[PDB]
Amino acid sequence: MEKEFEQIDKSGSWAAIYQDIRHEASDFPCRVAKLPKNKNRNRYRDVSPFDHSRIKLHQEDNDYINASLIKMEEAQRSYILTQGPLPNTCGHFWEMVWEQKSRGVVMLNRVMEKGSLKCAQYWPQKEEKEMIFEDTNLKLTLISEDIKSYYTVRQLELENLTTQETREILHFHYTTWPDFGVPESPASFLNFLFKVRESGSLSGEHGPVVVHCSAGIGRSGTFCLADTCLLLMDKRKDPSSVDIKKVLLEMRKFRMGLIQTADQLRFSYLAVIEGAKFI
Ligand SMILES: [Cl-]
Ligand SMILES: [Cl-]
Ligand SMILES: [Cl-]
Ligand SMILES: [Cl-]
């Protein structure tokens, strides 16, 4: 892989490899996402979950949320990739976390970037100002947060107000992705991924981790792609048999558009190459 990377870099053919992925990517129907009644549940009209892999909400109301289950069979990991919640879908977002039994939420954007809103403020910033989602009957309380220079980990308490059951949700927030482009070095991003892993949030004991950025396909795709490739490299007898392009095309059977630019593709390669050396 590190030779294929150096050759793609020497040849300058990241854009070509990336356009090949786009051309080969699966196309499945997104009928439900495009229903008129779901217009205000989609942050971007061009980014929709496929019907076959969308997450369905369970309460007696519209079951639609812009979220997809990515189930990587060989790597034996699942992820939920979703858009940054909208002001009217934060209750649905936490309903999904509850119903899918997720332990961790991975956020790869700041709520505002370059002075534009990428995502609703869907968790409480102050302990004493908890959030109640009256539509889905959930309460969300900030218990503590561990703010580091490049990411923050928050301990949130999510309470189902119907049953009074509570769960601890870990919010892993990568706060330093650049305004433009991708990180120059994958070190921070890998350290962040390894902290999510260390938490147990990605274990099969829990529901799938919920990963989002603004549309839930670009930075989020890099996170899940890197994580899955690194899993495959540990499992296979020949770890250089792991073909990142093939893994990405497999992930794109579950959600469209994962990895949004040739720079993100190169970054994913770089993260996998560097992450494998660490492990
Ligand atoms: Cl933020
Ligand atoms: Cl792991
Ligand atoms: Cl492969
Ligand atoms: Cl695309």
XYZ file of C-alpha atoms and ligand atoms in Angstrom:
283
model
C 0.000 0.000 0.000
C 2.767 2.440 0.832
C 4.188 1.688 -2.639
C 0.818 2.091 -4.364
C 0.428 5.393 -2.477
C 3.857 6.681 -3.511
C 3.081 5.662 -7.105
C -0.326 7.360 -7.140
C 1.369 10.451 -5.679
C 4.194 10.339 -8.228
C 1.671 9.827 -11.061
C -0.701 12.504 -9.705
C -3.658 10.222 -10.307
C -5.705 10.651 -7.090
C -8.437 12.473 -8.999
C -8.547 9.662 -11.580
C -8.713 6.936 -8.947
C -11.367 8.895 -7.148
C -13.487 9.397 -10.270
C -13.232 5.644 -10.901
C -14.719 5.013 -7.461
C -17.520 7.448 -8.182
C -18.245 5.730 -11.479
C -18.254 2.220 -9.942
C -20.264 3.110 -6.873
C -23.532 1.329 -6.161
C -26.808 3.017 -6.994
C -29.831 1.951 -4.955
C -33.197 3.640 -4.469
C -33.775 6.314 -1.853
C -37.568 6.459 -2.236
C -38.371 7.184 1.412
C -35.777 9.927 1.789
C -37.291 11.678 -1.213
C -40.902 11.570 -0.060
C -42.394 15.071 0.208
C -43.049 14.583 3.937
C -39.348 14.086 4.573
C -38.154 17.287 2.885
C -37.306 18.989 6.131
C -35.546 15.927 7.598
C -32.720 16.116 5.029
C -29.956 18.649 5.480
C -28.817 18.218 1.838
C -31.193 17.262 -0.932
C -28.315 15.521 -2.711
C -27.373 13.229 0.227
C -29.954 10.567 1.105
C -29.861 7.125 2.710
C -30.649 4.156 0.558
C -33.907 2.491 1.410
C -32.256 -0.846 2.061
C -29.843 0.420 4.704
C -31.652 3.365 6.271
C -32.171 3.458 10.007
C -35.875 3.368 10.865
C -37.208 5.137 13.947
C -39.522 3.067 16.129
C -42.043 5.480 17.615
C -45.560 5.917 16.246
C -44.671 8.750 13.882
C -42.805 9.109 10.628
C -39.908 6.594 10.855
C -37.499 8.572 8.725
C -34.058 9.803 9.685
C -31.172 10.576 7.326
C -28.940 7.786 8.634
C -27.545 4.586 7.203
C -26.321 1.333 8.734
C -22.931 0.400 7.244
C -22.348 -3.261 8.075
C -18.836 -4.404 7.176
C -19.106 -8.169 7.180
C -15.457 -9.214 6.875
C -14.253 -6.543 9.294
C -17.157 -7.475 11.649
C -17.902 -3.868 12.517
C -20.981 -1.751 11.947
C -21.387 2.002 11.915
C -24.334 4.358 11.637
C -23.442 7.256 9.368
C -25.784 10.202 9.608
C -26.003 13.894 8.733
C -25.425 16.530 11.389
C -28.836 16.846 13.050
C -31.133 19.723 12.074
C -32.965 21.870 14.588
C -36.059 19.731 14.005
C -34.323 16.315 13.996
C -32.308 16.391 17.225
C -35.030 14.445 18.982
C -34.967 11.892 16.178
C -31.209 11.687 16.386
C -31.253 10.819 20.052
C -34.186 8.474 19.528
C -31.988 6.655 17.000
C -29.097 6.488 19.480
C -31.461 5.064 22.096
C -33.197 2.567 19.840
C -29.989 1.360 18.200
C -28.282 1.021 21.589
C -25.279 3.067 20.542
C -22.668 3.827 23.179
C -20.708 6.433 21.303
C -21.375 9.336 18.967
C -18.471 10.534 16.820
C -18.655 14.105 15.597
C -16.095 15.230 13.031
C -17.044 18.870 12.572
C -17.491 21.957 14.600
C -21.093 23.213 14.856
C -19.933 26.328 13.014
C -17.105 26.237 10.465
C -15.905 29.164 8.367
C -18.759 31.068 9.976
C -21.446 28.685 8.599
C -23.601 26.268 10.612
C -22.791 22.653 9.824
C -24.890 20.983 12.515
C -27.459 21.871 15.196
C -26.310 22.241 18.791
C -27.766 18.870 19.606
C -26.159 18.272 22.988
C -26.061 20.462 26.102
C -23.055 22.631 26.673
C -23.823 23.248 30.348
C -24.509 20.696 33.076
C -27.341 22.670 34.531
C -29.137 23.230 31.185
C -30.209 19.794 30.127
C -32.041 19.232 26.859
C -35.505 17.704 26.705
C -36.720 16.386 23.350
C -40.444 16.490 23.858
C -41.286 14.840 20.549
C -39.332 11.683 21.322
C -39.543 11.952 25.165
C -35.830 11.943 25.884
C -33.714 13.982 28.248
C -30.031 14.646 27.655
C -27.679 15.923 30.372
C -24.014 16.862 30.146
C -22.311 15.057 33.041
C -18.685 16.014 32.330
C -16.308 16.719 29.529
C -12.622 16.143 28.938
C -11.472 18.871 26.540
C -8.158 18.195 24.831
C -6.301 20.254 22.274
C -7.590 18.385 19.221
C -10.711 16.564 20.431
C -13.190 16.590 23.311
C -14.808 13.548 24.938
C -18.093 14.258 26.707
C -19.982 12.057 29.101
C -23.673 12.523 28.379
C -26.594 10.950 30.211
C -29.484 10.044 27.913
C -32.703 9.292 29.757
C -35.776 7.747 28.213
C -38.378 9.805 30.000
C -41.034 7.153 29.343
C -39.243 4.374 31.266
C -36.790 6.525 33.297
C -33.968 4.262 32.095
C -30.698 6.125 31.660
C -27.625 5.401 29.582
C -24.179 6.908 29.453
C -23.308 8.043 25.935
C -19.778 9.030 25.069
C -19.528 11.954 22.692
C -16.227 11.947 20.821
C -15.794 15.283 19.133
C -12.860 15.851 16.776
C -12.593 19.594 16.840
C -9.594 20.437 14.637
C -10.350 19.223 11.125
C -9.128 22.057 8.864
C -11.482 24.610 7.359
C -10.296 23.605 3.897
C -8.830 20.385 2.711
C -7.705 17.532 4.906
C -5.204 17.390 7.777
C -1.610 17.590 6.583
C -0.751 14.648 8.873
C -3.130 11.900 10.047
C -1.532 11.745 13.522
C -4.294 13.605 15.397
C -7.051 11.849 13.512
C -5.493 8.465 14.263
C -5.011 9.320 17.907
C -8.675 10.275 17.950
C -9.736 7.034 16.282
C -7.631 5.051 18.752
C -9.313 6.880 21.644
C -12.736 5.942 20.282
C -11.590 2.334 19.990
C -10.126 2.321 23.518
C -13.485 3.471 24.876
C -15.188 0.274 23.763
C -17.724 2.307 21.774
C -16.979 0.342 18.585
C -17.264 -3.082 20.185
C -19.959 -5.476 19.105
C -21.263 -5.449 22.690
C -22.941 -2.134 21.899
C -25.075 -0.921 19.086
C -23.219 0.722 16.257
C -21.336 3.921 16.817
C -23.095 6.931 15.332
C -20.698 8.915 13.167
C -21.505 12.249 11.631
C -20.105 15.334 10.097
C -22.376 17.721 8.251
C -23.679 15.464 5.472
C -22.471 12.211 6.979
C -20.483 11.070 3.937
C -17.165 12.951 3.742
C -15.172 13.167 6.939
C -17.434 10.517 8.381
C -16.488 8.243 5.501
C -12.813 8.759 6.232
C -13.317 7.718 9.831
C -15.146 4.484 9.066
C -12.972 3.668 6.068
C -9.800 4.075 8.045
C -11.152 2.109 10.978
C -12.332 -0.773 8.787
C -9.153 -0.959 6.740
C -7.073 -1.064 9.887
C -9.260 -3.905 11.187
C -8.815 -5.814 7.942
C -5.071 -5.398 8.086
C -4.925 -6.942 11.555
C -7.148 -9.859 10.551
C -5.765 -10.927 7.150
C -2.720 -13.182 6.767
C -1.306 -10.813 4.113
C -2.287 -7.309 5.357
C -1.072 -5.772 2.082
C -4.001 -7.569 0.451
C -6.304 -4.905 1.898
C -7.459 -2.806 -1.048
C -8.753 0.510 0.226
C -10.638 1.217 -2.993
C -12.496 -2.110 -2.702
C -13.337 -1.441 0.921
C -14.666 1.985 0.034
C -16.823 0.559 -2.756
C -18.206 -1.976 -0.274
C -19.049 0.816 2.188
C -20.741 2.722 -0.632
C -23.228 -0.142 -0.981
C -24.656 1.164 2.239
C -24.471 4.921 1.895
C -23.889 7.078 -1.157
C -21.004 9.401 -1.644
C -18.697 8.226 1.108
C -15.414 10.123 0.719
C -16.297 13.373 -1.051
C -12.981 14.421 -2.617
C -9.760 13.030 -3.992
C -7.989 14.750 -1.062
C -10.134 12.798 1.383
C -9.300 9.603 -0.476
C -5.581 10.354 -0.282
C -5.958 11.209 3.387
C -7.700 7.918 4.086
C -4.809 6.044 2.416
C -2.341 8.056 4.467
C -4.232 7.393 7.704
C -4.369 3.694 7.029
C -0.665 3.515 6.125
C 0.333 5.439 9.234
C -2.182 3.711 11.509
C -0.963 0.284 10.454
C 2.597 1.212 11.337
C 1.451 2.313 14.819
C -0.424 -0.958 15.507
Cl -18.561 22.777 18.024
Cl -10.976 -1.868 17.686
Cl -9.717 -5.800 0.175
Cl -19.538 10.662 -4.865
